[PDB]
Amino acid sequence: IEMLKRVTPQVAFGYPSVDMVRKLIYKLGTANLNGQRIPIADNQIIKVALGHLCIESVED
Amino acid sequence: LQKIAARVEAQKAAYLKKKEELLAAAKANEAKIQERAKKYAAEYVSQTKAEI
Amino acid sequence: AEHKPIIHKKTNRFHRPQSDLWNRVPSAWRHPRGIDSRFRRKYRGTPLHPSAGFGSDKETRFMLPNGFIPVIVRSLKDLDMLLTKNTTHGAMISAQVGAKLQQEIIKKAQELNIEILNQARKH
Amino acid sequence: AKRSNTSAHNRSHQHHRNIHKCVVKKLWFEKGMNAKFLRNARYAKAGQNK
Amino acid sequence: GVDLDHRVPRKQRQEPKTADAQMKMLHNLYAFLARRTGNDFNAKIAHRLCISRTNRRPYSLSRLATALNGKEAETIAVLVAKITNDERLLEVPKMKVCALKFTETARARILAAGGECITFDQLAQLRPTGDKCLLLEGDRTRRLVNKHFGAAPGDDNSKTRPKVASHGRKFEMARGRRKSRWYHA
Amino acid sequence: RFSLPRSIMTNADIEAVITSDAVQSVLNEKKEVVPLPKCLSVGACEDW
Amino acid sequence: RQTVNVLAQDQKASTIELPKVFDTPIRAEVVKEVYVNLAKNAQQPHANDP
Amino acid sequence: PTRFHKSRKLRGQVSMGFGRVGKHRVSPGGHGRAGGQHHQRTWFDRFHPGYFGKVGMRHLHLMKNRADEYEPTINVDKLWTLVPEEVRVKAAAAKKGDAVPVIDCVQNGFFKVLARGELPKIPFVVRAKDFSEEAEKKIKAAGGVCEKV
RNA sequence: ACAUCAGUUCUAUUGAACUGAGAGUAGGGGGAUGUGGACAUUUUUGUGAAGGUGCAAUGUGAGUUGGACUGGAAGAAUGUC
RNA sequence: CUUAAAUGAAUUAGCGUUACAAGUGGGCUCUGACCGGUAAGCGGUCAUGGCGAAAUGGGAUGAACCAUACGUCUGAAUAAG
RNA sequence: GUACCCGUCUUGAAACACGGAUUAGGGAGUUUAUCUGUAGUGCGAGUCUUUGCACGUUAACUGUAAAGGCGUAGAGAAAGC
């Protein structure tokens, strides 16, 4: 928050609801894997990255 | 080359062993994601009913 | 052969700046190094610079309106180069080659089916 | 004749292109330090290996 | 418009700048292995073949006798360099070695005491994993040019050796080098 | 002064060395790149 | 060691084994660097009127 | 040669890689070692310290074939390098008796001997002009003789 | 959608799929075009060489090539120097 | 030598080291702070930014202000205005 | 609809700053010595064969004896080490 106080003129920000956090990740969501900027496509992308952390598919 | 042409026959089978196995693993996961999506739906609506 | 529709990205040739004005200056392109030059700066109403932006497709590069990529053919011995790549490349016989050997290269080509791009030498 | 004496406009810019942290090799500096301390620190090491 | 630092600080040598057949060939052998076997040994041998001739320092035969003293038989000393014999070492041990080249003095000494004289493409058949191998390298700073490198001489104390044709008194020994003539570095 | 020059390899070519079963047994399997789809992934969004 | 025949003057007279110079590897780069510099030796110095 | 130079690629570029504002010109500093105590002192101070000044004792008519200047050195670790390797193998198999080989340093152009490394326990005889203290000590300990010339 | 330069995943034999970036004076690096002559290798030419004038292609571009008229005897390519 | 117990802020990121060499050593300036001056498009400093080497759009017009910093094209929706 | 004249010193040039009537052909970072550092190549405690001699299808190429250069031990004004 104190970092955001310095940069307040450069950014717009707020507190998104669950329907908005959903709709970003389904439409526009992408995974930065090994510095490649890969599109999210299928849930086997994010099982391989994040399955050890108990996050299996895009809902999780 | 005769040994390599023999050995690729094992790599055909060992490929198709994992093809059967990982598809079977996928169907087990396709059961378990469905309960989580139903959980988080009914967990979200109960969060709203709690505060309201 | 099968290919895309050929599209060039620039139609005309690039002129050097101020080449239209003067006969001393040839119209072959030269990158302008002037300190106060408008052209180096890119202002509006200057020509765009030749650059890797204008590069044509990797499939259709060096490709004629016909279809075929022209290899130059200087003799009967050099015509063996086009035997492998029959319907991708095609022949283009040199201007040095005279009227007698012109007819022999056409007769060799019609046997082996290699399309010759040179046209209408005459007589 | 009379031109500028100095400036610091873009001292900061140049310094930050690269403020590299020069690391010390070891904390002891045996050129300094007490000789009477270091004299005894030799006879600790010399006696031990025998 | 993106804020990145576009410059490259670090190049690295990927393939060798030699125009040989053989150095370029057996680079691709150990490049092929280093990828496919996925191992730390072959990755090093691949990279050592890239690097320039100055860094491939000539690992002498007395250093080879010191390394292998202790180590049991069927243990190759793999070495991406030239081997050069020592005069001063007297009786060579019986030892198994692999390098790019030997000197013809050194090859005589190793063979005459029942040793082995192995090439890198020969070694790729024997030990792909590098099990009971021993990678060695000459020290980088043993070159004479390397002693001129460092803090500039005269920094108190550089210990870097000034670039001079002729040594003795008269050539660079007075005002700077000694405290009698004003100052000492 | 001259003496007769040695080669670096013992063999002429590489391809005999790689194809031998001494090498081949140690190697991992030859991989190949997947091309990735461009597209509803999730099995039940209609609960939401 | 491998062999090559010797033609009779007319024909084959006998078979003689190769000497050990034919072992040594063929080097395009090394033969270039030598020949390029060695061909400069086979030339005449010339200059314009000073 | 003239193809590979950087000058060849700098056609069109107007200054040929030498600046506009400064203008590449023949005498920036002054000639050779000039201004070593003045305006090029920083170069002398930084890279070649001790350049200025006089030190030492003047030597008149120095000759280097005198046996005052001229002493080549050799070391105790070798010596055996001077003799071929068939000799000392025979000298290893010997009693405390006879036939101890003479390693002549002075024929080969080595006057003094200097002990930096080891020997074996073979007997031998060093003919040389001079020794060190430790070189004389090591040759005794191997089991051999120190001749002077 | 396309080009270039990086990189990431792989690939023996020179490549594949995919992601990212975009000003530039003084200045530095990489690859490429053209000219006089040389050494190999391969040719073209009185059924018309080089050169020159106009026109149509082709290359991002330096350039290169075709055909027509003029000319009347030599030119050019590939790899190294 | 060893007896215990763990990787004990956030956000981000590979980090370290060496060699050789170019150009440069006249700067100017918006917004704030400041010294001298009646004041200056004046002289001399400070902090971030800009120009110099930065196009395009906007301020009719303008090196410096605002939006924004650029491969070649085809659209959509915007910024300053 | 857009578009100020190029080259140049300059903080700043369309400038009421200087050079420039037209066209063709000439026209400017080269070479030597003593070194530095990086990369390539050969040999390696060695290395260089050249001053010169012997060869030659002759300024080349080829063969080779012995010195000599630099390296292999340094510090000190020097004795001595």
XYZ file of C-alpha atoms (C1' of nucleotides) in Angstrom, chain C residues 8-9 13-14 28-30 40 42 50-52 54-58 61-62 64-65 74-75 92-96 98-101 119-122, chain I residues 1-4 16 23-26 42-50 56-69 74-77:
72
model
C 5.088 -7.229 -52.847
C 4.554 -4.737 -49.952
C 11.831 1.589 -56.352
C 13.353 3.763 -53.611
C 20.241 4.425 -56.519
C 19.520 4.557 -52.770
C 22.012 6.045 -50.293
C 17.334 11.035 -41.636
C 11.764 10.940 -40.815
C 14.294 0.794 -47.056
C 14.376 -1.594 -44.112
C 13.564 -5.121 -42.928
C 9.502 -4.211 -46.349
C 10.832 -7.801 -46.687
C 8.622 -10.106 -48.770
C 7.460 -13.592 -47.705
C 10.080 -16.349 -47.283
C 11.014 -14.377 -52.479
C 12.715 -14.105 -55.915
C 8.278 -14.339 -60.834
C 4.663 -13.497 -61.877
C 25.025 -19.977 -69.172
C 25.558 -23.275 -71.078
C 16.649 -18.157 -67.624
C 19.101 -18.223 -70.544
C 21.834 -15.565 -70.682
C 21.963 -12.593 -73.082
C 25.512 -13.585 -74.109
C 23.816 -16.616 -79.321
C 21.051 -17.667 -81.706
C 22.391 -21.173 -82.488
C 22.901 -22.293 -78.868
C 10.911 -14.600 -74.063
C 10.648 -13.358 -77.646
C 14.320 -13.195 -78.622
C 13.001 -12.985 -82.212
C -1.250 -11.078 -41.876
C 4.035 -10.471 -43.219
C 9.586 -9.212 -42.477
C 13.853 -8.783 -39.328
C 11.480 -27.207 -36.349
C 13.965 6.328 -32.047
C 18.779 7.160 -32.782
C 23.948 11.954 -33.592
C 29.517 10.921 -31.954
C 33.742 -23.896 -65.727
C 32.244 -21.618 -69.890
C 30.105 -17.739 -73.569
C 31.245 -15.061 -78.466
C 31.001 -12.504 -86.366
C 23.874 -17.433 -85.931
C 27.399 -10.748 -82.988
C 31.578 -9.982 -76.974
C 32.229 -5.567 -73.973
C 9.994 -4.751 -68.382
C 10.762 -7.724 -64.265
C 13.526 -9.120 -59.610
C 15.958 -8.015 -54.426
C 14.112 -4.632 -47.933
C 18.537 -2.488 -50.232
C 23.658 -1.746 -52.235
C 22.418 -4.243 -56.836
C 21.137 -8.119 -60.507
C 18.705 -10.103 -64.785
C 15.684 -10.343 -69.325
C 14.204 -8.620 -74.304
C 14.705 -4.213 -78.288
C 17.827 -0.699 -80.925
C 36.325 -9.689 -76.658
C 33.466 -10.840 -71.782
C 31.668 -13.348 -67.597
C 30.533 -16.988 -63.546
